[PDB]
């Protein structure tokens, strides 16, 4: 049909695959769109009802702002900016609440699995903070002893990764093409040997070695890319790849309709 795709391996959290019959700008733009443009959900504004702990308030704000959130059903709701409402209706936002107490004699931790959804969830799978390990605790927030109190009111909104790294799903990326340098898009700094002084790529063996003596294949062109996507976990990885493709084409179609309407 066109740009074929081959999966090398996959997991719960990362997809590694091969991309062929494609051009360089296409692949690179896909990379950047995945790293910057995926809409998601994240906690955004926070009201301290009561802080007592040694930990500072804007730490509590900033460190809250970075907890990843469940965002399968992110498309169902809409932006707070475009929303018909004002001040965080259920159909544009979600509300989070935290409670802590210095109960024990020893220090008590406050994990992400303590904040609870409050507002109308309206049956769409949104907002539950991800627990990656197998021991129930989310990610650590704050510690308390015997007298400190936290009472937090939190509001999440849409947001995208372009204006803050909160709203990223991307978390890493990988990229490689022509591991054998047949395209001569670089030449190696060295002092005895390029071949000896550089480690071989891991992706060398999926293409043949350069056959040693044949002249420079000038007419050739880059293809056959090597991607490894590894999401943070706010959304499954197949979803992030497909959504990135979808939002890139949504952008291009938008520019097309703007042109036609002009």
């Amino acid at each position: 049909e066109g740009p074929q795709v081959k999966i090398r391996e996959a997991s719960k959290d990362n997809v590694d695959f091969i991309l062929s019959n494609v051009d360089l700008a296409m692949a690179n733009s896909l990379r950047r769109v995945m790293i910057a443009e995926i809409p998601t959900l994240a906690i955004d504004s926070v009201e301290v009802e009561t802080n007592t702990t040694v930990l500072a308030d804007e730490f509590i704000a900033h460190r809250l702002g970075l907890i990843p959130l469940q965002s399968m059903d992110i498309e169902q709701l809409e932006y707070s900016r475009d929303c018909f409402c004002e001040d965080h209706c259920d159909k544009c936002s979600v509300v989070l609440t935290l409670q802590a107490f210095g109960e024990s004699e020893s220090t008590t931790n406050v994990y992400s699995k303590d904040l609870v959804i409050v507002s109308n969830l309206m049956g769409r799978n949104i907002g539950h903070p991800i627990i990656q390990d197998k021991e129930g605790n989310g990610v650590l927030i704050c510690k308390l002893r015997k007298g400190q109190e936290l009472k937090l009111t939190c509001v999440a909104k849409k947001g995208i990764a372009k204006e803050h790294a909160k709203w990223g799903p991307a978390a890493a990326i990988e990229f490689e093409y022509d591991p054998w340098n047949k395209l001569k898009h670089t030449d190696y700094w060295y002092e005895q040997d390029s071949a000896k002084e550089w480690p071989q790529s891991k992706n060398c063996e999926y293409e043949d070695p350069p056959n040693e003596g044949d002249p420079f294949d000038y007419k050739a062109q880059a293809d056959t890319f090597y991607m490894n996507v590894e999401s943070v976990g706010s959304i499954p990885v197949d979803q992030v790849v497909v959504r990135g493709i979808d939002t890139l084409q949504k952008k291009v179609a938008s520019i097309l309709l703007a042109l036609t309407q002009m």
């Binding site: 049909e1 066109g2 740009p3 074929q4 795709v5 081959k6 999966i7 996959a10 494609v22 051009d23 360089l24 700008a25 296409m26 690179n28 733009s29 896909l30 950047r32 769109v33 910057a36 443009e37 900016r81 995208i160 372009k162 204006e163 803050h164 197949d238 790849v241 497909v242 493709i245 979808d246 890139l248 084409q249 952008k251 291009v252 179609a253 938008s254 520019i255 097309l256 703007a258 042109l259 036609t260 002009m262």
Partner: protein, 115 residues
């Protein structure tokens, strides 16, 4: 005070278009276009595929300053063939190719999920 934040980084033109169509005066059938709220992640793609098309003669994009999320693009081509038609052909090519890529990806993803 009036120092801009990141709201103007990608929100499309408030009381403004998405793009301008201004004719060059230095070569026959040349147009410059000014997109805004976009950057390399679209410009490089459009330029590369439009250059892949054969009927055009010149296609290059630049961003003027990284403080501003706008960038320009200049197209000239041989007679009869309109540059705007060239651009819309390019966009149709892009939408088709990566729609094919998408469908191919769900097929192989569902296949790799065993059974």
């Amino acid at each position: 005070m009036n120092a801009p934040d990141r709201f103007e980084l990608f929100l499309l033109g408030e009381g403004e278009s998405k793009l301008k169509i201004d004719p060059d005066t230095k070569a026959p059938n040349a147009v410059v276009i000014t997109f805004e709220k976009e950057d390399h992640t679209l410009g490089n793609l459009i330029r590369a595929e439009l250059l892949n098309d054969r009927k055009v003669l010149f296609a290059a994009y630049k961003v003027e300053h990284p403080f501003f999320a706008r960038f320009k693009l200049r197209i000239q081509t041989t007679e009869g063939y309109d540059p705007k038609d060239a651009l819309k052909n390019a966009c149709n090519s892009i939408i088709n190719k990566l729609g094919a890529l998408k469908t191919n990806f769900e097929t192989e993803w569902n296949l790799q999920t065993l059974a």
